Amino acid sequence: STGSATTTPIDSLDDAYITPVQIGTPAQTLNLDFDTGSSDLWVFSSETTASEVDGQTIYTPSKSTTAKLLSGATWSISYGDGSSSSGDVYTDTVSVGGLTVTGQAVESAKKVSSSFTEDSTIDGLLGLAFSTLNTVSPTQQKTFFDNAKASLDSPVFTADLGYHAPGTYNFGFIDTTAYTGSITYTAVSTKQGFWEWTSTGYAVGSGTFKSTSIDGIADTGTTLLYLPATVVSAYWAQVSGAKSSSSVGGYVFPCSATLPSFTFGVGSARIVIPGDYIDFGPISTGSSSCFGGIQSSAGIGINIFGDVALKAAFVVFNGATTPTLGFASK
Numbered sequence: 001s002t003g004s005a006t007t008t009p010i011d012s013l014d015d016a017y018i019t020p021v022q023i024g025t026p027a028q029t030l031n032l033d034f035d036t037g038s039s040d041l042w043v044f045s046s047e048t049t050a051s052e053v054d055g056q057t058i059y060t061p062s063k064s065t066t067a068k069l070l071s072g073a074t075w076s077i078s079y080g081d082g083s084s085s086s087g088d089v090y091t092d093t094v095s096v097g098g099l100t101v102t103g104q105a106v107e108s109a110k111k112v113s114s115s116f117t118e119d120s121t122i123d124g125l126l127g128l129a130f131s132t133l134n135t136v137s138p139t140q141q142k143t144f145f146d147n148a149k150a151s152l153d154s155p156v157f158t159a160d161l162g163y164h165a166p167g168t169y170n171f172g173f174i175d176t177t178a179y180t181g182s183i184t185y186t187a188v189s190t191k192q193g194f195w196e197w198t199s200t201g202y203a204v205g206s207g208t209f210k211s212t213s214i215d216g217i218a219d220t221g222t223t224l225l226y227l228p229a230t231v232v233s234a235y236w237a238q239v240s241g242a243k244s245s246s247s248v249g250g251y252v253f254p255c256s257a258t259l260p261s262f263t264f265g266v267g268s269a270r271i272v273i274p275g276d277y278i279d280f281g282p283i284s285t286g287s288s289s290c291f292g293g294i295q296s297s298a299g300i301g302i303n304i305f306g307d308v309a310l311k312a313a314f315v316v317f318n319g320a321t322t323p324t325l326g327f328a329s330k
């Protein structure tokens with residue numbers, strides 16, 4: 001089997017991407033944030049505290065002929081950004097882009113934090129990290145990918161995120177029309193449950209490439225690129241007037257600037273992030289200070305190749321017995 005679904009940025013900054021997902025029978029279509037940095041498929045639902053719902057589409061298990069309560073199971077998750085949600089669990093039929101899984105754990109939110117309520121465009125998350133991170137208790141559940149792998153033509157999915165444009169998630173095949181050149185594959189550690197890999201170095205603009213190992217995760221659910229303070233300082237030193245603002249919570253730069261590109265290594269290959277991808281616009285409406293898309297990881301504990309980095313590439317998440325990542329330019 002394969003599936004192919006379009007993913008669409010939620011706003012003009014590419015802060016997140018939503019992908020339609022069919023849940024239940026008859027189908028209930030919800031727009032989910034596909035998140036390679038977590039392992040729970042959770043949704044706004046008929047169970048979500050009414051005051052915490054503001055515009056989202058909800059899943060109503062009682063209207064699905066295929067829904068069943070996963071009796072006794074609960075879940076609770078918090079993300080890197082301090083957001084959280086929790087609830088109970090149903091199993092139901094879930095389809096993405098024409099690929100169907102039966103018996104998928106659909107985690108129904110009873111509570112969501114303010115950051116989810118305030119974003120009316122995201123109806124829940126679909127986790128695509130390793131199932132060892134799934135938060136369902138007392139019986140951990142599998143991701144949609146982990147359940148689909150029993151059926152896919154090839155045990156892979158690919159992320160092809162757009163810059164201020166739609167892109168694609170494919171399951172079970174690699175679209176050789178979607179990238180240029182060749183795909184460079186690199187080793188993955190699953191020790192922390194993430195798609196964790198080691199970049200071979202970086203360059204700033206037209207500068208020399210610095211060969212240096214940078215461990216980090218490929219995380220479609222994180223907007224920005226979080227790297228070591230040394231790397232980030234070297235980047236922003238090339239932008240006149242850029243500074244790390246303690247009042248704003250990272251590097252800001254004059255909105256009049258032209259940003260340099262940023263290159264990261266994948267083995268002997270190089271992925272170039274254009275400078276405009278690193279522009280996240282005014283810090284507040286009408287401001288002439290703009291927020292940077294490359295930020296320090298020093299207060300996280302891990303480096304994160306978020307959307308800023310991933311949308312410069314065609315990315316293969318190889319879930320073969322020994323998982324690997326592939327990157328191609330596009």
Ligand SMILES: C[C@@H](NCCn1cccn1)c1ccc(F)cc1
Binds near residue numbers: 223
């Ligand atoms: C609550 C939420 N924001 C969606 C992303 N966004 C960035 C700026 C605005 N929206 C979220 C939190 C964590 C996460 F892994 C996914 C989604």
